[PDB]
Design a protein around this ligand. Structure first.
Ligand SMILES: [Fe+2]
Length: 872
DNA sequence: CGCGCGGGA
DNA sequence: CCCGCGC
């Protein structure tokens, strides 16, 4: 977020052009440009981006999400004068309080109303109790009294809550998540009346949003229940309609949930007073709100002065009436526990699968349990983010390791003297040069060997935010504190300022976008500034300066070591990237052999990534839910091979585990933090769906492919990429590029990079080849959605039962196809999918997890094992 | 192989 | 919409 400016995020279904006009008028009076954007997946995008201290200055969303944001410290406290607060209705301010603090400005107010056909029903009923008799009349006329969405409890809750239901008890400025109001007599009475309506055929238990909307807008039912978003559609129809107070139940008003569109201020915003002034003096005025409202209607409004104007529309007046008789929707993330439990209870009670009493008894206890576990997982997440490696660092160990490293440097120097230079395998390594193309030979059936630098330029210098560590003492400090043990005397360590790293990340994605999401001139310009580390073994540590926001979340209350280097004091270090050079031998034989076995046996699924950026082959423990009949680990070819093999059903599973474990073993010898990361993030329920004793569940494979610069947001904390070559020839380009670290390299005999793929922008330049040479690239990574879904399937059916279910589902689908054709087989699979989906959601509702994940971002931590350094 | 159908959200 | 799947 740039100082002296305002950027606003607001959903696409809003009046952003009108809002942009208010910005226009604001820029005119102040000189401060206001840019209005409507990103996709806005509800998810804001907490993900603001968690890194970036994103908009102002966010527009339903107030209920803003309590979760406040828990995460994403929002600035709002400080309106009492004179300003008087201009908005008092209950709208209650909607934007968290822990006694105002956290947003209310804008608009929405709630469900009763919508009725004036021609079928000139005087709509005041009571729910009237509706049975009224439906008898209209049934005689070939019509019905009432149709509304019965599938979503947002819609049925106003009746259920009328006589006493509630979500969480509110008291002393806080919701008590132990106190759920789902199982009291009021709730029971309301749901009973609802199910009696279905029991007496006045409503259909299958009625959903689309069925009700179509029936009301076609003149077939006299009433529906909907919000202001539905008025447009009714306005295109022939129906003469009104909007009024919801019916009472037992003389009490129906209690719809109230949603308040609100404007929050990013805690990481340099422009908080500019934001406050724009919101208080430009938007929250009649002129302001009208400009927005003319673009797309706001519905009811929080500003008393404009609401008095709008309320001349009786539909708006009714909205505010229903809203004032309703309950503000609780603004805490545990509402998800509430929603799932009540949705289940209403569906079961409407289908007779449970009595009303059993349905609500179980929703009550289930919602409370899920909300409690939700809290417990949030606190556990803080422990994993702040976890520390087993301590091997000390001042004595530092110094001894510094001696051994200094000895190894002399020995490597002497060995370089005796050989005439530095070599990685057979490849001559000279850091004075950048390796732009190079030759490989294939003298035998082993892997092709990198032999000769072909095209080069002088090697660009390191960027200024990246520093090679010269001191063996500092080398030993970081090695012992971070669980990195690179080849003695034959590696280079680097320190990278965390703030510049983040700026450079953003510049790299800016360049990729400007190029049209490809390697074009802007990405090339950055590549020309990257320093080649081809043939080197290196590690990059980032240093986060103690806040006296950010992408990185070190705990500066954790234990502190004394650095030999004074400049680390007041900072935390983490490992962002490491490049290894694996000596060809037994391990490389095993790995290459498994790739060959899996290719020959057709076990890779071929997919396209990033539109048509490149082609990628995948294997591993996927769960492809797009495949309706998938109910076990692996791609569809893997499911099939277990049944169709006439030798050994698990053969490809053995191959995959050896492949992941062998790559993992090679990496773990150098990076002892890797098994610590595995042990920390993989749950007991996730472990059977990893590949062996690793943090890998998915493995990719690419053949002479470039890849645009990007981040892998849905993967683990660290990712492993390797390359190996087949056949001889010359490759130009194809470098792996880490532009925010300012480095690139050509993979040689068997280069491996281990890096934080969710937070370091990276990519592979396109390549050109001469001869038959093939560069095979492969990522081993954690794709957490698959392990979560599989862990959930495991909890629902039993881990070992998945193969049996998978075999049965394959057989039942083949049978249908062979008997009744392709369309029948697709119908069997769709049925399987909905059965699978229901089971997964139930386990997901029970907080069953394969991996630990950030509750705020829905992703894995940006880094782990931060080490604080302090030198008094 | 292409392009259909498909799930989840 | 997308590091699937099957006609
Ligand atoms: Fe990647």
């Amino acid at each position: 977020i740039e100082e002296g400016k305002l950027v606003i995020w607001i959903n696409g279904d809003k009046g952003y052009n009108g809002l942009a006009e208010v910005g226009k008028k604001f820029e005119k009076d102040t000189g401060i440009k206001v840019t209005v954007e409507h990103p996709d997946k806005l509800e998810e995008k804001f907490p993900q981006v603001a968690a890194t201290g970036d994103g908009p200055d102002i966010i527009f969303w339903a107030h209920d999400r803003f309590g979760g944001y406040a828990q995460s410290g994403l929002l600035a406290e709002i400080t309106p004068a009492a004179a300003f607060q008087d201009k908005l209705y008092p209950f709208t301010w209650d909607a934007v309080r968290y822990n006694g603090k105002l956290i947003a400005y209310p804008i608009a107010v929405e709630a469900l109303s009763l919508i009725y056909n004036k021609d079928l029903l000139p005087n709509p009923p005041k009571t729910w109790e009237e509706i049975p008799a009224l439906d008898k009349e209209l049934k005689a006329k070939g019509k019905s009294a009432l149709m509304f969405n019965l599938q979503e409890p947002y819609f049925t809750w106003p009746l259920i809550a009328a006589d006493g239901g509630y979500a969480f008890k509110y008291a002393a400025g806080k919701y008590d998540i132990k106190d759920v109001g789902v199982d009291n007599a009021g709730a029971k009475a309301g749901l009973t009346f609802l199910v009696d309506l279905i029991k007496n055929k006045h409503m259909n238990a299958d009625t959903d949003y689309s069925i009700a909307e179509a029936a009301f807008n076609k003149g077939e039912t006299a009433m529906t229940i909907n919000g202001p978003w539905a008025w447009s559609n009714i306005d295109t129809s022939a129906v003469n309609y009104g909007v009024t107070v919801l019916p009472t139940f037992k003389g009490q008003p129906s209690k719809p949930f109230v949603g308040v569109l609100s404007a929050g201020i990013n805690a990481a915003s340099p422009n908080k007073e500019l934001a406050k002034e724009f919101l208080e003096n430009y938007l929250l005025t009649d002129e302001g709100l009208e400009a927005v409202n003319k673009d797309k209607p706001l519905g009811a409004v929080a500003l008393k002065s404009y609401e008095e104007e709008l309320a001349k529309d009786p539909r708006i007046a009714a909205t505010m009436e229903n809203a004032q008789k309703g309950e503000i929707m609780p603004n805490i993330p545990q509402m998800s526990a509430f929603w799932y439990a009540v949705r289940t209870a209403v569906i079961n009670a409407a289908s007779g699968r449970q009595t009303v009493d059993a349905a609500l008894a179980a929703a009550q206890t289930n919602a409370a349990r899920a909300a409690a576990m939700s809290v417990a997982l949030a606190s556990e997440y803080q422990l994993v983010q702040n976890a520390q490696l087993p301590q091997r660092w000390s001042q004595s160990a530092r110094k001894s390791l510094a001696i051994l490293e200094a000895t190894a440097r002399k020995e490597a120097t002497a060995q370089m003297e005796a050989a005439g230079g530095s070599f990685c395998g057979q490849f001559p390594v000279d850091p004075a040069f950048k390796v732009l193309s190079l030759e490989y030979s294939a003298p035998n059936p082993d892997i092709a060997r990198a032999i000769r630098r072909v095209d080069s330029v002088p090697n660009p210098p390191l960027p200024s935010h990246v520093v090679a560590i010269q001191s063996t003492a500092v080398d030993a400090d970081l090695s012992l504190a971070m669980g990195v043990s690179l080849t003695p005397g034959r590696h280079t360590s680097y320190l990278v300022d965390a703030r510049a790293l983040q700026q450079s990340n953003s510049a790299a994605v800016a360049a990729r976008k400007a190029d049209g999401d490809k390697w074009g001139p802007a990405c090339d310009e950055m590549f020309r500034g990257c320093r080649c580390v081809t043939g080197q073994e290196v590690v990059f540590y980032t240093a986060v300066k103690e806040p006296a926001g950010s992408l990185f979340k070190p705990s500066f209350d954790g234990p502190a070591f004394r650095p030999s280097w004074g400049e680390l004091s007041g900072k935390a270090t983490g490992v962002v990237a490491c490049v290894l050079q694996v000596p060809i031998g037994k391990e490389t034989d095993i790995i290459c052999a498994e790739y060959d076995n899996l290719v020959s046996k057709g076990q890779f699924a071929t997919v396209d990534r990033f539109g048509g950026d490149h082609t990628v082959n995948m294997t591993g423990n996927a769960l492809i839910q797009n495949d309706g009949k998938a109910i076990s680990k692996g791609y569809a070819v893997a499911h099939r091979a277990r049944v169709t093999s006439n030798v050994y059903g698990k053969a490809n599973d053995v191959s995959l585990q050896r492949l992941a474990e062998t790559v993992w073993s090679v990496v773990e010898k150098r990076l002892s933090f890797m098994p610590a990361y595995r042990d920390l993030v993989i749950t007991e329920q996730g472990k059977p769906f990893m590949l062996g004793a690793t943090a890998t569940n998915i493995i990719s494979l690419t053949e002479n492919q470039g890849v645009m610069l990007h981040l892998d947001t849905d993967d683990g904390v660290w990712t492993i990429i390797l390359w190996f070559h087949r056949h001889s020839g010359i490759i130009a380009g194809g470098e792996f590029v880490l532009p925010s670290l300012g480095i690139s390299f050509q993979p040689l005999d068997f280069t491996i990079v281990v890096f934080a793929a969710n937070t370091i922008v990276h990519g592979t330049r396109p390549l050109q080849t001469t001869g038959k040479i093939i560069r095979w690239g492969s990522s081993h990574f954690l794709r957490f959605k698959d392990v979560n879904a599989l862990a959930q399937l495991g909890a629902a059916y039993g881990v070992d039962e998945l193969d049996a279910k998978q075999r049965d589902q394959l057989e039942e689908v083949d049978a249908a196809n062979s008997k009744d054709g392709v369309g029948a087989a697709r119908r069997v699979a769709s049925c399987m999918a909905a059965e699978r989906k229901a089971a997964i959601e139930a386990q997901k509702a029970a907080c069953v997890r394969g991996v630990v994940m950030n509750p705020c971002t829905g992703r894995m931590p940006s880094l782990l094992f931060w080490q604080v350094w302090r030198k008094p």
